[PDB]
Amino acid sequence: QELFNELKPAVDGANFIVNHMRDQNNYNEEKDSWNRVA
């Protein structure tokens, strides 16, 4: 499991990046919905 231990920071960073992108996309979608209501 040494290779997985070495790659674990990369996997954690990738998951963090993915979560950040998903949260930003959902935030932008809600803003767009408010624009549509306006």
Partner: peptide, 23 residues
């Protein structure tokens, strides 16, 4: 395997930048 270590460093830097942007 220097390439994998460099990719790990790049991913870690990207994650750190995103975390700083979140703060």
């Amino acid at each position: 395997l220097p390439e994998l270590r460099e990719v790990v460093s790049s991913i870690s830097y990207i994650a750190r930048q995103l975390q700083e942007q979140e703060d």
